Amino acid sequence: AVPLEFGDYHPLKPI
Amino acid sequence: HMLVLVLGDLHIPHRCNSLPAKFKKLLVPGKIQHILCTGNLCTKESYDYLKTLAGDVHIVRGDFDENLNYPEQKVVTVGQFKIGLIHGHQVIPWGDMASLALLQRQFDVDILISGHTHKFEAFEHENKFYINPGSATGAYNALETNIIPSFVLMDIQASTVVTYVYQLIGDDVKVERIEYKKP
């Protein structure tokens, strides 16, 4: 697995 | 997208008293469609919590679960994927890759989910996908106490699964991504 950066989508990212 | 929460080895209340606060802030109602739990909730407190997150909750029996009604294993279909679920204390020696590949063959699944080791893994072997979410609370295991709290969220659409791994490490939530395509 690849670590995500600040801008990247993930499903629990607040919106 | 079908969102599946994968978690287990909570060991609440005997080893840990709750999920990390930063995990609870992220895990909110209304987003998750299915929960696949490797077991060792040990108690109804945690089952009840999972039901706040999604209606469709699947648990398999852990070696420390109070609830004996949970099935030992389960096979489910989400999107195009056949997924197998087992706690994995039945794997001898613990976490053995040959043992996991043997369970994959016995269940005939595209994705095998198992627990027990309290160590996260997400990898493709012989074109099959293997997931272990770790312990969502960072509960100690039979060998070790430096356990990183973690869980997985699979985002399934058709032939593609994107697996997001959430870890509480360095006091912060770290997210990692891996992708698997059905052959």
GROMACS .gro file of C-alpha atoms in nm:
model
  198
    1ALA     CA    1   0.000   0.000   0.000
    2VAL     CA    2   0.097   0.364  -0.089
    3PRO     CA    3   0.067   0.649   0.166
    4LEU     CA    4  -0.180   0.921   0.071
    5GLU     CA    5  -0.088   1.291   0.044
    6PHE     CA    6  -0.302   1.581   0.181
    7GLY     CA    7  -0.495   1.633  -0.144
    8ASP     CA    8  -0.582   1.267  -0.209
    9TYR     CA    9  -0.930   1.119  -0.187
   10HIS     CA   10  -1.022   0.860   0.071
   11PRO     CA   11  -1.373   0.762   0.169
   12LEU     CA   12  -1.364   0.892   0.528
   13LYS     CA   13  -1.208   1.228   0.436
   14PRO     CA   14  -1.437   1.493   0.580
   15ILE     CA   15  -1.643   1.703   0.338
   16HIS     CA   16  -1.907   0.256  -0.517
   17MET     CA   17  -1.989  -0.003  -0.244
   18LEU     CA   18  -1.800   0.087   0.074
   19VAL     CA   19  -1.713  -0.201   0.307
   20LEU     CA   20  -1.565  -0.145   0.651
   21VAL     CA   21  -1.335  -0.436   0.753
   22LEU     CA   22  -1.228  -0.450   1.116
   23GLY     CA   23  -1.196  -0.673   1.420
   24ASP     CA   24  -0.993  -0.782   1.718
   25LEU     CA   25  -1.132  -0.500   1.923
   26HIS     CA   26  -1.117  -0.690   2.251
   27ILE     CA   27  -1.344  -0.442   2.428
   28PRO     CA   28  -1.362  -0.417   2.729
   29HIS     CA   29  -1.099  -0.674   2.853
   30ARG     CA   30  -0.789  -0.553   2.661
   31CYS     CA   31  -0.902  -0.211   2.541
   32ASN     CA   32  -1.186   0.015   2.642
   33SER     CA   33  -1.265   0.192   2.312
   34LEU     CA   34  -1.152   0.266   1.961
   35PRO     CA   35  -0.904   0.557   1.926
   36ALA     CA   36  -1.075   0.892   1.945
   37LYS     CA   37  -0.946   0.990   1.601
   38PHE     CA   38  -1.097   0.675   1.450
   39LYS     CA   39  -1.432   0.743   1.608
   40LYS     CA   40  -1.433   1.095   1.454
   41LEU     CA   41  -1.386   0.951   1.106
   42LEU     CA   42  -1.634   0.662   1.144
   43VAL     CA   43  -1.966   0.835   1.110
   44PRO     CA   44  -2.306   0.701   1.010
   45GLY     CA   45  -2.437   0.720   0.655
   46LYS     CA   46  -2.125   0.640   0.454
   47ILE     CA   47  -2.058   0.266   0.495
   48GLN     CA   48  -2.275   0.009   0.316
   49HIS     CA   49  -2.149  -0.322   0.468
   50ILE     CA   50  -1.935  -0.416   0.769
   51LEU     CA   51  -1.725  -0.735   0.760
   52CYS     CA   52  -1.589  -0.805   1.109
   53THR     CA   53  -1.329  -1.070   1.185
   54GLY     CA   54  -1.468  -1.107   1.540
   55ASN     CA   55  -1.337  -1.069   1.897
   56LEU     CA   56  -1.574  -0.786   1.977
   57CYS     CA   57  -1.618  -1.003   2.269
   58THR     CA   58  -1.940  -0.801   2.367
   59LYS     CA   59  -2.271  -0.654   2.254
   60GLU     CA   60  -2.142  -0.304   2.326
   61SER     CA   61  -1.932  -0.323   2.015
   62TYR     CA   62  -2.189  -0.496   1.803
   63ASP     CA   63  -2.428  -0.218   1.889
   64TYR     CA   64  -2.166   0.034   1.784
   65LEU     CA   65  -2.118  -0.126   1.447
   66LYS     CA   66  -2.488  -0.113   1.383
   67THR     CA   67  -2.478   0.266   1.425
   68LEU     CA   68  -2.238   0.276   1.134
   69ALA     CA   69  -2.426   0.047   0.894
   70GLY     CA   70  -2.728  -0.183   0.903
   71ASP     CA   71  -2.559  -0.471   0.721
   72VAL     CA   72  -2.315  -0.611   0.975
   73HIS     CA   73  -2.143  -0.949   0.932
   74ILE     CA   74  -1.940  -1.095   1.215
   75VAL     CA   75  -1.756  -1.425   1.240
   76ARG     CA   76  -1.668  -1.591   1.570
   77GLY     CA   77  -1.350  -1.505   1.744
   78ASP     CA   78  -1.184  -1.719   2.009
   79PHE     CA   79  -1.282  -1.467   2.283
   80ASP     CA   80  -1.634  -1.368   2.164
   81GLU     CA   81  -1.911  -1.406   2.419
   82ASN     CA   82  -2.168  -1.446   2.144
   83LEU     CA   83  -2.168  -1.805   2.031
   84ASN     CA   84  -2.424  -1.744   1.758
   85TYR     CA   85  -2.166  -1.595   1.522
   86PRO     CA   86  -2.070  -1.831   1.241
   87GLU     CA   87  -1.718  -1.964   1.230
   88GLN     CA   88  -1.679  -1.842   0.873
   89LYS     CA   89  -1.878  -1.672   0.603
   90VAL     CA   90  -1.868  -1.625   0.226
   91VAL     CA   91  -2.040  -1.319   0.076
   92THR     CA   92  -2.061  -1.149  -0.262
   93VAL     CA   93  -2.006  -0.768  -0.296
   94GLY     CA   94  -2.001  -0.634  -0.646
   95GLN     CA   95  -1.830  -0.899  -0.862
   96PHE     CA   96  -1.613  -1.031  -0.572
   97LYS     CA   97  -1.663  -1.346  -0.373
   98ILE     CA   98  -1.521  -1.264  -0.026
   99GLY     CA   99  -1.434  -1.509   0.251
  100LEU     CA  100  -1.427  -1.411   0.622
  101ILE     CA  101  -1.275  -1.603   0.913
  102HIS     CA  102  -1.116  -1.497   1.240
  103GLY     CA  103  -0.803  -1.698   1.176
  104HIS     CA  104  -0.710  -1.858   1.515
  105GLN     CA  105  -0.780  -2.174   1.314
  106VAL     CA  106  -0.464  -2.090   1.109
  107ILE     CA  107  -0.169  -2.288   1.250
  108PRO     CA  108   0.101  -2.156   1.279
  109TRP     CA  109  -0.051  -1.811   1.321
  110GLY     CA  110  -0.065  -1.600   1.001
  111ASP     CA  111   0.118  -1.865   0.792
  112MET     CA  112   0.097  -1.766   0.421
  113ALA     CA  113   0.071  -2.128   0.316
  114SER     CA  114  -0.216  -2.165   0.561
  115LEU     CA  115  -0.391  -1.859   0.416
  116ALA     CA  116  -0.348  -1.978   0.059
  117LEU     CA  117  -0.490  -2.310   0.174
  118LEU     CA  118  -0.800  -2.135   0.319
  119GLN     CA  119  -0.840  -1.940  -0.004
  120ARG     CA  120  -0.848  -2.269  -0.196
  121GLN     CA  121  -1.089  -2.430   0.049
  122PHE     CA  122  -1.327  -2.130   0.032
  123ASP     CA  123  -1.277  -2.059  -0.341
  124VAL     CA  124  -1.281  -1.679  -0.285
  125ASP     CA  125  -1.144  -1.376  -0.474
  126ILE     CA  126  -1.067  -1.195  -0.141
  127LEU     CA  127  -0.987  -1.366   0.190
  128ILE     CA  128  -1.032  -1.153   0.509
  129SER     CA  129  -0.879  -1.285   0.833
  130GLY     CA  130  -0.768  -1.152   1.170
  131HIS     CA  131  -0.609  -1.294   1.484
  132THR     CA  132  -0.252  -1.162   1.433
  133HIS     CA  133  -0.341  -0.798   1.506
  134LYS     CA  134  -0.108  -0.695   1.221
  135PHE     CA  135  -0.248  -0.529   0.912
  136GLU     CA  136  -0.175  -0.692   0.573
  137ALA     CA  137  -0.322  -0.617   0.225
  138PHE     CA  138  -0.153  -0.805  -0.064
  139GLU     CA  139  -0.208  -1.005  -0.384
  140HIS     CA  140  -0.073  -1.359  -0.406
  141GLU     CA  141  -0.138  -1.592  -0.699
  142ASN     CA  142  -0.395  -1.338  -0.830
  143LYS     CA  143  -0.606  -1.357  -0.513
  144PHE     CA  144  -0.633  -1.070  -0.258
  145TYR     CA  145  -0.563  -1.120   0.111
  146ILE     CA  146  -0.667  -0.865   0.380
  147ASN     CA  147  -0.607  -0.860   0.752
  148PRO     CA  148  -0.738  -0.533   0.907
  149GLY     CA  149  -0.537  -0.567   1.217
  150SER     CA  150  -0.690  -0.472   1.555
  151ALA     CA  151  -0.902  -0.157   1.542
  152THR     CA  152  -0.818  -0.080   1.906
  153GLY     CA  153  -0.449  -0.182   1.901
  154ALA     CA  154  -0.521  -0.466   2.148
  155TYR     CA  155  -0.230  -0.674   2.262
  156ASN     CA  156  -0.193  -1.008   2.092
  157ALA     CA  157  -0.070  -1.341   2.222
  158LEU     CA  158   0.294  -1.228   2.160
  159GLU     CA  159   0.324  -0.852   2.166
  160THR     CA  160   0.187  -0.524   2.297
  161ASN     CA  161   0.324  -0.260   2.047
  162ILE     CA  162   0.020  -0.301   1.825
  163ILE     CA  163  -0.081  -0.022   1.581
  164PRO     CA  164  -0.459   0.042   1.577
  165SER     CA  165  -0.595  -0.013   1.226
  166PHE     CA  166  -0.888  -0.092   1.006
  167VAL     CA  167  -0.956  -0.117   0.633
  168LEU     CA  168  -1.218   0.027   0.405
  169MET     CA  169  -1.269  -0.150   0.068
  170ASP     CA  170  -1.423   0.063  -0.206
  171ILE     CA  171  -1.570  -0.187  -0.452
  172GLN     CA  172  -1.695  -0.110  -0.794
  173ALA     CA  173  -1.745  -0.387  -1.045
  174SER     CA  174  -1.405  -0.561  -1.103
  175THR     CA  175  -1.199  -0.318  -0.904
  176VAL     CA  176  -1.135  -0.289  -0.531
  177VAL     CA  177  -0.949   0.004  -0.385
  178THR     CA  178  -0.847  -0.080  -0.025
  179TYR     CA  179  -0.782   0.209   0.210
  180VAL     CA  180  -0.585   0.125   0.526
  181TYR     CA  181  -0.629   0.351   0.831
  182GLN     CA  182  -0.368   0.342   1.105
  183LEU     CA  183  -0.320   0.539   1.425
  184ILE     CA  184   0.051   0.606   1.426
  185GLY     CA  185   0.256   0.896   1.565
  186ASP     CA  186  -0.075   1.015   1.732
  187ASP     CA  187  -0.231   1.082   1.390
  188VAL     CA  188  -0.439   0.893   1.135
  189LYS     CA  189  -0.226   0.771   0.849
  190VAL     CA  190  -0.405   0.649   0.529
  191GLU     CA  191  -0.256   0.415   0.266
  192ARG     CA  192  -0.409   0.286  -0.061
  193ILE     CA  193  -0.379  -0.037  -0.252
  194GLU     CA  194  -0.565  -0.158  -0.558
  195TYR     CA  195  -0.669  -0.504  -0.668
  196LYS     CA  196  -0.839  -0.601  -0.997
  197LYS     CA  197  -1.025  -0.930  -1.042
  198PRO     CA  198  -0.850  -1.125  -1.328
   0.00000   0.00000   0.00000
